[PDB]
Structures are given as structure tokens and as C-alpha cells.
Symmetry: C7
Subunit: 244 residues, 7 copies
């Protein structure tokens, strides 16, 4: 799930263990593609809502301006092309948890709607007046300083405070170097199992190579380097290409 | 109805005065400083006590619906007006309406609100029928309205009409003696979901809370207090901007 | 008709003169200096006293309904017009219309008002039918209309027709003798409106009232006095800058 | 009508020469300086005196309706055209049309007026039917049309067609001998609608009027005179323009 | 055209030459300098004299109807095309068309004209039937068309086609000897539709007429002469205006 | 036109080599410099010489109809498409198409052309049916197309597709030995028109024609020589350039 | 394939390695430099050999139809969509899709592509039905994509997914040993598709070809060769860029 070793990273998980027991909103900060995904899934699994549903949406990746319709759902005719009814992500997360990835990418109007969801514990689909009662635990993510974003007038202050009771900052890779190697081995394992392949190991000098690179792209970059290495082929031996 | 600071107590004594009458009351001071309970207090201490109390945040109605929810509308009044709907003024009949963050109303909306205040009548959008009103008006603003008038963003005639009895609700750091009893209250109300309320917080944590400027006022305190309860139960060593 | 300052008394006497005539009267000076007493005073001194008195605030009509309100309209004349509706001029027939804050009309509306004044007729929006008018005109402005003409924002012919007889109602600090009878006056009516004995005003509170410049003129004074009543029934010290 | 300054008398004698002809006449000079009657004069001294006299102010037609009222229209020529309507030229058939303030036409309207002058026929908007015309044309501008041509705002060919016999009506201060009979005529015309015509009385009213430069010309004098009659209604000296 | 000044007479001899042919003729020179008749002179001197002479002023067609007037149209071709209507080229069949002030055609229009010139065929707006043409083209321009080409406002290929044979009709002050002969004609032409031809116009008036630079050329002269007749019969002193 | 200058004879020699093939030929040089003869010559020298020869001038199609006439269209393909209509490529089947002034196609049209060249099929607008094409392509530009590519106005892939065999047709002043045969040919064709063909220009007129630089090339020459004929028959110093 | 420059040979050896896997391959280098062959070489060297090979040039789809072409659509999806139409991904099921000049896709379209790679399914425009996908992706770009990312024109997440294994095909003046065999190949080709004549080529012409920097790379070489063939039909020296 999430295996790690840097002491700083262990402290974060201990922190995550404390909020997990409660139903507080968690904000996960840090660079994108740095592994915030599993920390979210980790929190849900440690929470009383573990058996409930876990729903994730990436607010920075929904095409055709469909973000708002995805979250809130809609009735037929709510907008051009709404040719059927569809339930929102919140409705799907009922009794469980919802992850709102890259939340800083919602427009102000959308933030106002999210704010009403949070304080009212209810949601209404687009083109509908009926409110649907909600029992949902909210996790979110931002790769931005949200306070800064508030002060620049792009993020609502009242929403910032409701989403920020318990911020956890997930470090970049270069400031938890002890997590490289268990991460890399986990990436290998993951990739080979999915392809139905024996999982190889990483020679010590490749490890060193991996430990002494700053990882501008963090884990997304690491996962790339590692998949490339497997192509250059099995049991990895300074088949590690950074920027050569 | 919580306070202890001498400054705040003088304010509630002034509240008591206006409450007796039907005068419009404008509440100034920063957003999320506690205003909403001043207004509920004023209503409770007023002869309209048994009447409805209706509030609206003019800065938090999405989809441009603020005007629609204030005045109500008839079916067809605008695109989406698919039904008739009473406005907030109608609902406050015989009681009190609180217009929070009034400084957000655009000039046209302001001109409509002025008429309501002058005629004690209101018409729904898409209707020519005026409804006789008996409503006590309360309002809040987090900005200096005199200035906003002088900048051409707020009607002068509306400012005076709402300015009979302006009460300024000071920032938290300017009423430091409210911080301890506020923190406590915030603790009990939060725990009031099968949580045994941890007491006061330890004296050193009191001190810590007293020696912080609270740039986010009561909203910030609430965050800090709920965060403290997560970290856990009967607090000592909790967190704020400049945690180290 | 509540004044005692010499400025004001002379003003009212001038107003008594136009009153007897059918001339357009323009009332200048700041808004919220209570120049509504003047226009209603004029109507009541006029031969049209028993006729309707119709006021409209040109600077306070929402949704751009100003034109439709003045001139009236037929069903379908513009989007939203689902009925016929008489204008303010029609309602003022045989009496007086008050066009408060007239410097706010756009130029197109001014041309229409000019034709109304010249032809003594009015057409509703979406109608080609003329309605004969017998209506006395009064108006106000808090702007200098002459400058507004030279800035190209106001028609010159309309200016001349509206300004045969301008009366400038001065700021409160320029008629300090009006302050106390005014203060007493609106105490009385924000007391009679609630049925209870009218309280006294401490001599020192008086001097406090007379020595303030009143940037908001009568509108401001009204606030101060209402506030004084809330702080309760016997003026001693109630005020307008805690600093 | 009603003049005394030799400057004015020469203009009137010039007008008598043109009136006998069918030439287009352009009358220059400031707005609200009395052109209306000089046009009227011209028509009365013309062989068409028994014909229609039709006047239109190009600077005062609301709602962009200038073109519609000039040329007329058929039902549905534009949105709002719910009927057929004769234009001003049709109404002037066998007489005279006055286009006051012609410099206010946009260029496309000018091109249409040019055609009408050339072909002596006119077509209603939304129609292709031409109506042969027998109409004498008079016109005014308060601006230098020649410079207006050079600024690109007025058609050269239309300027020439309308500039056969331009007559310049001087500002009031440039013909002071007119001011006293003008005042008198303004008073009577105004009192003629109920009251008895007072005299302007000796100078101290007259010379006061005479030593003022009248930036607003006769519209301004008209106002001063009406105001004076309010101040009141027999004597004078109570003339106000600065104060 | 009535003239003297040799230079004018030289022009007419050039005109007599083109007239006998079918070539396109461009008449240059200021507007309102008597061009309109030189073209009619060309028509009458040409073998097409008995045929139609058709004139359109490209700088004077209101409501953008120039293209519709030139080419004609079918019902519905544009909004308000409520009937069929033949173009000017159709009406000029077997005769001559004068395109006055052609420099005012937009580029699209010019391309259409070019094709008419090249194919000797025309098509009505909103139709694809081409009508065969047999039409002599005359044009005028009060501007330097070669430079207008260089300014990218006039097609080069069209420039060459219309300028086989340009005739530059000079401004009045450049042919002083035409003035008196023209003047009398104006007087003669006018008293024609009325009474006895006044002229006998003092010689001092002639001199006055001859020594004026005529900024407005013939149109100005027409004005002065007409004005003169109004001030009375038998020209003596006349205006331009109350001196300078 | 016979052609004689040394330069030109070599270009025609090059044209003959590429004519025997199916290669796209691009002809550079100034517009109106006789490129039409090069294109025609290539077709008549090619194996497809008996097939259709279709020319379009991309810089001369009004109403933005260039794409429509190139590709053809179905009824309804666009506002005004009230008919099906075959494109110029279809009409060129088994032969040759000349795309004159190709540099004028917008980038979207260029991409559509590139597709036709690549797939050797074409779709009419508003259709999605492919028509197989056997058409040889010739093109023309008066721009340097490489530079037009580097400026972002022309597709690089399209440039390379059309650039296999570019031929630069020289300006007139650069093939001076061609001026006299050309001049004679121009006169001769023009007079085929019942006019007897006027003899080969006086020698002095030839030298006059030779010592001019001809900024307008053949278009300008044709202009001059037609003028000369009007200054009638048999040419001397009837040649005008700038005087 | 068709190369002899050792740099080129190393490139193919890498191509062979990635070919046997299912990884996305990105081919960099200048446009008009022969990426075409290579994509195809990979396909034919991969386990998806006999599956369909589908190529689309993202820089060459007119009328803004790239999105429609890629994803397909139902009738009524956009204006003009008068039929249902399968997308390129559907056509490539069990095979390989080549996305040429991918840097040319807009951000919205990039976000849809990302979803296709992540979820291994595709919706037609104007439909909610997801088609399960089994397709190997190849891509090309003549731009430095990392910098395109840094300039904000390309999605970072999509960049990483497309670049586990970038291969950079150098310009012709970096692989001068490829030039002669390539020119021969074009001669062979462009006269196999004729009346089957017979080829040739002269020493001094080779030198000419070898000492030119080829700003247009392969595209320009092809013009020169075709042109030279026209200019004769045997031997040479008549190679042109004067």
C-alpha cells in the first residue's frame, strides 16, 4: 500500500493515523506525482469508513469542463449535451470517503458550491432543486500553497479554513532520500506483477545512482526511470538513465 | 452571548439598546470574527424574538442566485426559473433577516434593496405584485462602507439607511480576553458528537493561544482548536503558522 | 416647511413666487439636504395643490426601468413587458411631477423628455399614440448642470427649459440656523411614529450639533438623531466620530 | 421676423432674393439663435407660401428614428415598424422642408439625402417604390460644414448641393440692436397664454440685457425673460445671468 | 463638353481616338471637375452611341447596395432580397457602362469585376447562371490608382485592365481658359429652363472668376454662378464669400 | 510565344525534361510574367497532353469560394450550397491542374491539399466519399516559398511535396531578347478581333520597348502595346510609359 | 530498416529492446527524418506483428477533426457529424497506433489522451459508452517536450507517460553514413514504380551529397534525388541546391 522508511515520512504516517480515526477533512500538500494517492487510500483504510466507498477525482484532469457536473451530478437537460441523469461523485462516496485531487484548480464559483456542500452536508445535482443528504469524509490535495492562493484572490478564505484543519505536507523525493529504494522496488514490483513478470532486484550501484539524483519529477520521474531500466532489462545494473 | 472582554461586553450592552427598537443594525469588523451570534443575540433580545430568524451570506450564493434568493421569483423569471419560489424577505415576515457581507451586492441589487427598505414592500423577479413586508433588517460588512461609497461601489442613500447604529466587532487580538472562553466553547461544541470535552486545554496552551495575533480571527481559532483535539484529547502542544 | 435660517427663508420666498406659476422649477444643492420639502411645499403653494403629486427618483430605478416608468408602455414594447402600464406623467395629470436627480438620464432619454416638455404630449413605449399632458414639472440635481452640458453629458436645450428658475438649497453647514429646528422636528416625528412623550435636548448637545460640518447634511443628521433616541430619550451626548 | 440690426436686415433682404427661387438654402449660425423663423420667413416669401411647411430637428429625434421619419417606412422595415408611415418629404409635397441641424446625419443617411436631392424622388425604408418629389429644401447647421467635410464627417458632393446660397445668422452679441425687440416679442409671446404683456421698462433692464454677451443666445434670453416675469410681472431690473 | 484651353482640346482629341474603339477608359482628375460628360462624349463618338448608356456612382450607393446594384441578384440572395433584379451590366447590354469613382470598391468586389472583365460574363447575386455580356466600360477615379495598388487597396491585375488608356482631366485652375466658356454655359443651361439668358456679365466679374484658384473646381463654379444669378440678372459682383 | 532569349530556351529545355514525367512542377517568378505559357507547354509536352488542362487562380476567387471550387461540394455543405458541384480536381481527371498563385491558400486549405497529393483522392465539402484521382499537378507562386515556410505561413511538408522541380520564370527585363517576339504576339492576338495585324512595330519603338525595365512585366507590356494601337495603326513612338 | 551509421544502428538495437515490450515509445528528432519506417519497424518486431498498424498525423488533420478522428463520434456529436464513426484507437485494437507530431495536440485533447492511457478505454465523442482498449502507443514529436511542458503547453503527467523510452533520430548531418544508402533506396524505389528501368550513381555526385548539411534532412534528400532522376535517368553529377 504505502511502504516508506524516511523517519520524516514515518512521522507523517503517524500523523495520518491520528486523523484517520476522526472524520476531519484532510488536506495533503506537496508536489504532484509525489505519492499523495496512497496516503489518501491509507487514511480511508485506517478510518472507521474503511469498508465504505473510496472515490477519487482529479480536478486537474477532467476534460471538456466536466468537473462540476462530475462532482455534483446532473439531471437531464441541465446543460447542453446532458442527455441523461447522472449521479455525482459525492453521491457515490456516501458512507465513505472522497478524494478531491488538485483542488486548487476549481474556479471560485465551484468553490462556493463545494463550500455549501461542506457546511450543509448535502448536495444538489445540476438542474435540480432537490438536496441529497450526505455522509461523506473529505480528503483533498493541492500542489500549491493555498494560503498564498487565498491571498492572491483565487481561493476562498472560508473554504481554505474548512479544508485546512489538518494539513499534511508530503515532502519531495530529494528530502526523504531513505524512501528511494523501497519506493523503487515497490514500483518495480507493481509494474512486473501487472505484466505477469518475475520481479527483479536493484544492484547496489544502481541504488546509489538512484539515491544521488535530485528527482525534479519526484515519483512520477522515478517510476519512469525504473520502467526504462526494466526495458534495458531484468535485474537492474546501472541501466538507470537520468539525463545522459 | 459568550464573551468576557470588557470591549465585547460594552458592545452587547449597545446591542441590548437597539434590540429594543426596530432600527437597522450594521455589524462591522472582520469576517469570521463571530458576527452571526451578535445578530442572533439582537433578535433574541428584540420583541420579534418569537418570529423567524433568516440569514443569508451575500458572498456565498453561487450561480448568481443571490438576487433570486433575496426577492424570490416566479416561474420563467430567468433561465432556470422553472418554478415559483418565495424570497428570504417573505420567509422573515414578522421576524428578522440578516444580510451578511452586504458589501458584495452589486449596485443594481443595492437599488432594489433600497426600495424594499423604503417601501417595506417586495416583489418577486418576474412579478409586478408587491408583498407588504414587516421585517427587521440586520446586515454585516467586513469593509468600511463609507469608503466603499466614496469609491463608487456602494449607494450613498443605502449606506445612511443602514448606518443608524453601526456596531464594530473587533478583531480577536483586540479582544484578547475572549480567546480562552471562546476556545472552550469551540471545544465543547465540536466534541458534542460523542466526545467527552477535554478541559480548558493546559495552561501553557492557553498562553500559547493568547500570544498569537489571530490574523484569521475566530475561523482560525476554530481550526487550531479542532486540530489540537485531533493531535489529541486535553491539549498542550499544538500548532500554528510558524510551527517548528 | 421647517427652517429659520435667513438663506432658507429667502429661498422659500422665491419658491412662493414660482409656485404661483406653471414654470419648471430646478432644485439644486446636495442630495439628502432635504430638498423634498421644497418641491412638495411648492406644489402645495401652487394652484395645482389639490392635484396629484408624483415623485420619481431617476437615480434609483432598478433594471433600467426608468424610461418605462416615466413614459409607461404597451404590452410587448420590450422584453418583460407582459402588460400595458401608464407612465408617471399620465398619473401626474392636472398636478405635479417631481423628477428627482435628473442629471442621471442618458442622452436618448433627455431627447424624449425634451419632446414631452415642448409638445406637452407623451407616448408610451411601443405605442404611436400621443397623450395630451397638463403637468407641472419640478426637478432636482446635485450636479451643476451647466458643466454637465459643457462636458457633453446633458442637452443644452433641455438645460435651458429646466432652468428658468433654479433654486439652490445649500449644505447644512451653510444654514446652521436650520439645524436645531430640524433636529427637534425629526425627533418629534420619530416619536409620534411610536406614540410617546418627546424628550429634551441638552444645551451642550445642541452646541455639539451646531459645530459639526455635516458632510452628509440632513441624511447624516437624521442618523445622528435616530441613534441618539436609541441611546435613549433625553439627548445629552450622542454623536458622529468616537475618535 | 421682428428685427432691427442693419446686419439682420441685410440678411433678410438676401433671404427675399432666394425665397423667390427654388434654391436650397443653408442657414449657418449658432443653435437656438432664431433660425427657425428665417426658414419660415423664406417659405412665406416664396411662391410656395401656401404649401406645407415641414420642419425636422436632426439632432433631437430619439431612438435612432431620424432616417425612419425622414423617408418613412413600410410595415416591417425594421423591428418596431408595425405599420406603414409617410416620411417628412411626402408631407412637404408642394411646399418646403426644413432640416435643422443637418450636420448630425451619419454618412449613410447623407448618401440617401444626396440621392433624394439629385433625383427628386424618395423611397420609404423597406420599399422599392420611388415617390417623385416637388419639395423646396431648407437646412441649418450650427457648425462650419466645410471644415466638417475636410474632417471626413460630411460628404463633399452633398455640401456643394446645399451650399448654393448659405446665409449666416449671427450670434446675439453680434447684432445687439435686435436684443430689445427680441426681448419684447419673447415677453408677449409668453404672456400670450393668459397674462397681460408687461414692459421691459427703461434701461437698467434694457442696457443690462444689452451689455451681456449671451453665450446661450436667444434660448438664454428667452430664459432670462421668463425668469424676470416670475420675479415679477410689471416692472423690471430683476434680470439675472450672473449673480 | 464645352472647352478651350488647348489642353482640354487635346484631351478630347485623345478621347475621339479611344471612342472609336472598344477599350476600357479610365478618367482621372478631381471629382466635380466635369468628368461626367466626357464619358458621355465618348459614348456618343463611339459605334455604340445608339445603345444604352448606364452610369453608377460607386461612392454614393447607400446601405452597402453597390455590389447588388452592379451584379443584380435573385430573390433571397441577401437579407431583404425580396425580388429578382437585374444588374447595371445587364442594363448596359450592347452599350456602355460608366463606373464612377471606382477606387471605392472593396477588394472582393474588385475580384468580381475582374472576372466580369475577363470572361465578359456576369452572374447575379445568389445565382450561378452567367449572362453573356457585350458592354464597353468607362471608369473614373479621383485618386492615383497606381499608388492605391502599391498601398494594397487595389488589385494590380485590375489596375492594368482598366488603365490601357487613361485620360487625366485637370483641375480648373490648370485650364483657366475653360472657365468663362463653362460659366456662360451654366448661365445658359439654367436660363434655358426659365427665361432670357442673362450673361452680359461684366468683364470685371469675368476677371474675378478667372483669378480664383477654384479649390472646388466645377462644382464650386456651379455654386458661384447659381448664387450670382440669384443676387440678380446680369452678373456684376458675386461671392466667394464677402471676399476672403 | 515562340520565345527567344537564351535564358528562356533553357527553361523550356528543363520543362521538357520534367514534362515527360508525372512530377509536380512549381513555377516561380513574378505574377503576370507569362507563367501561363510554361504551364500550358508542360501539359502539351507531357504524356497527358490530350487530357484536360484545368487552371485556377487561387488569388482571384471572390466570396472565399476557393476551397469550394477546388474540392467541389454537396448541397448544404455551406450556407449557399444549394447544389452539388464537382471540384476542379475531378475535372482534371486524366490530365493536369494548374494551381496559380498557390501561396495564397490559408493553412487549413494547404493541409487539405497536402492530403489530396498524398492519397491521390479528394472529398467534396459536406461529403465523406473519396474520389480516386489521376491528376498531374502544376503550381505557381510569386513568393519565395521556402521563406514563406520559415515565416509560418506555408506548410513545410507541402513545400517539400511541391518542390521536386522548381522553375523560375524570369522577369521581363531579365529576358530582354523575348520582348520583341512577345510584343508582336500580344498585338497579333489582340487584333484577332477583325483588326488587321499591325506590322511588327517601328524599329525605334522596339528599342524604346527594350530599354524599359518593365516593373509590371508582361501585363504592363500588354497594356502599353494596346495603348499604342489606340494611338492608331503601326507603332512608332506611340509607346507611353510615364510620358 | 535502411541504415549504416553506427549511431543509427545503436538506435535500432534500442528499438529492438523496447519492441518486445508494450511500453509507449516516443520518437524525437526532426520531422521529415524517417520516423515512419522506425515506428513500423517496432511494430513488426513486436509481439503485435500481425495486428493492425494505424498511423495519424496530429499536425495534418484539417477542419479541426483531429479529436473526432482519434476518438470517433456518434451522430449529432458536433455540427456536421451526420453518422457514427469509429476512432483511430478502435481501428488499432490488438495492434499499434502511431501518433505523429503529438506536441500539436491542445491541452483539452491531451487530457483526454491521458485518460485513454490510464484507463485503457475510449469514449466516442457524444457517447458515454467506454470501449475497452488493447493498443500499443507510439508517438513522435519534433519538439523538445520537456521544455514544452515547462512553457505550459504540455501536460506533465502525459509527458512522463509518453517518455519512459525516448529514442532520438538525429538529423542527416549527424549521421552522414546513412546518406548514400538512403539515396540508393530512393532511386531503387522511385524506378521500381516506373517502367522498371535500371539505376546507377557516380562517385563525384556522392561526394556532393555527402558534403551538404541537409537542412531539410530526408525530405530534402528525396527532392534532390527525384530531381536528379528527372534531370537524367543514368549516372550523375547533376545534384542540385546550387
Amino acid at each position: 500500500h504505502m511502504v516508506v522508511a524516511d523517519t520524516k515520512s514515518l512521522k507523517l504516517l503517524a500523523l495520518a493515523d491520528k486523523v484517520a480515526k476522526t472524520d476531519a477533512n484532510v488536506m495533503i500538500l506537496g508536489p504532484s506525482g509525489s505519492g499523495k494517492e496512497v496516503m489518501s487510500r491509507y487514511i480511508h483504510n485506517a478510518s472507521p469508513r474503511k469498508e465504505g466507498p473510496f472515490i477519487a477525482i482529479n480536478c486537474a484532469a477532467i476534460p471538456d469542463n466536466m468537473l462540476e457536473a462530475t462532482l455534483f451530478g446532473y439531471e437531464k437537460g441541465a446543460f447542453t449535451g446532458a442527455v441523461q441523469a447522472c449521479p455525482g461523485k459525492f453521491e457515490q462516496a456516501q458512507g465513505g470517503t472522497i478524494l478531491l485531487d488538485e483542488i486548487s484548480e476549481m474556479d471560485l464559483n465551484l468553490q462556493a458550491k463545494l463550500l455549501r456542500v461542506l457546511q450543509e452536508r448535502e448536495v444538489e445535482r445540476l438542474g435540480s432543486r432537490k438536496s441529497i443528504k450526505l455522509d461523506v469524509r473529505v480528503l483533498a490535495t493541492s500542489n500549491r500553497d493555498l494560503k498564498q492562493y487565498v491571498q492572491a484572490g483565487h481561493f476562498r478564505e472560508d473554504l481554505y479554513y474548512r479544508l485546512n484543519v489538518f494539513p499534511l505536507t508530503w515532502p519531495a523525493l530529494c528530502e526523504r532520500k531513505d524512501d528511494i529504494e523501497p519506493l523503487a522496488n515497490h514500483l518495480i514490483e507493481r509494474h512486473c506483477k501487472k505484466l505477469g513478470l518475475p520481479v527483479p532486484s536493484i544492484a547496489p550501484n544502481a541504488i546509489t545512482k538512484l539515491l544521488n539524483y535530485p528527482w525534479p519529477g519526484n515519483v512520477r520521474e522515478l517510476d519512469n526511470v525504473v520502467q526504462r531500466a526494466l526495458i534495458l532489462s531484468e535485474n537492474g545494473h546501472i541501466q538507470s538513465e537520468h539525463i545522459l
